[PDB]
């Protein structure tokens, strides 16, 4: 499609794609004991254990509001690890960061836990909303199954199993029913099904170039005055 044409896009004064130690005039320089009288520094060697305790708190303090949902605790754990594995797998050389990446990430995670302790972190609220929307749909299926009724998801699974038999019952010259064929059969069913639903307009433009919004009503004028409520 389109690729960045500038070959020097990732160049910095410090090197190629360097976002760990940008070049600045006041660069780090060494210190010599025999000549150093006093010093004021905030660096220390406590980040490793603070990285550990921070993980335990963020996990244990967020589980307070999961109500024993084991599947959510396990899903949240996978998401929590993705937040702590950022420095271990990033392109950025987190080991060469300016003034210590270890202290930087730890202090950054602490600001997240502060919000987690109050149950105000956006990832928490995002989790509650996403889960409630999920359980409502699983309960809708349960109520339909207890009534002996068939779910919309099973009607497709059953409608797709038969469509495969019809295709392989005529596919006798060959006998390699690829995953590609299996896929485009389902998509042909999904498009037909989705179009059947009364969904809000998602694409800007319909079959014509014109937009599918309620505002795309141009001339000619054929609508009369609006009518009132009926008694």
């Amino acid at each position: 499609g389109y690729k960045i044409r500038n070959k020097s896009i990732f160049w910095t004064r410090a090197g190629w794609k360097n976002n760990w130690h940008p070049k600045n005039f006041n660069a780090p320089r060494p210190s010599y004991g025999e000549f150093t009288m006093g010093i004021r520094c905030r660096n220390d060697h406590h980040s490793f254990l603070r990285y550990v305790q921070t993980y335990r708190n963020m996990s244990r303090h967020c589980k307070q509001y999961f109500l024993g949902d084991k599947q959510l605790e396990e899903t949240f754990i996978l998401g929590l690890r993705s937040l702590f594995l950022v420095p271990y797998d990033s392109q950025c050389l987190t080991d060469q960061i300016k003034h210590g990446g270890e202290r930087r990430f730890v202090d950054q995670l602490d600001r997240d836990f502060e919000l987690i302790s109050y149950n105000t972190h956006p990832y928490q609220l995002f989790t509650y909303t996403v889960r409630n929307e999920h359980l409502a749909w699983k309960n809708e299926q349960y109520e339909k199954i207890q009534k002996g009724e068939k779910t919309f998801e099973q009607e497709l699974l059953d409608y797709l199993d038969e469509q495969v038999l019809a295709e392989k019952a005529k596919l006798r010259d060959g006998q390699n029913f690829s995953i590609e064929r299996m896929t485009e059969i389902a998509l042909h069913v999904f498009r037909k099904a989705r179009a059947g639903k009364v969904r809000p307009a998602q694409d800007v433009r319909g079959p014509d170039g014109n937009v599918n919004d309620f505002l795309e009503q141009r001339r000619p004028f054929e609508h009369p005055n609006p009518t009132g409520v009926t008694h």
């Binding site: 995953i179 998509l187 433009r205």
Partner: protein
């Protein structure tokens, strides 16, 4: 045809789970290209509507 090489059942269940892993990924990429069909011209959507297509960015 009834049963054979209970040791063979080791890879029958290994390759079956291995395939289920990469079938889940195939469905991820397949479903994304399916939803991507209704999304066209990011420059024609409002700001708060684009974030809704890419749910999670606002969070």
């Amino acid at each position: 045809s009834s049963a054979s090489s209970k040791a063979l059942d080791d890879i029958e269940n290994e390759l079956s789970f291995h395939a289920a892993i990469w079938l889940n990924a195939y469905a991820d990429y397949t479903m994304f290209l399916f939803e991507l069909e209704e999304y066209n011209d990011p420059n024609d959507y409002l700001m708060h509507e684009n974030f809704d297509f890419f749910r999670g960015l606002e969070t």
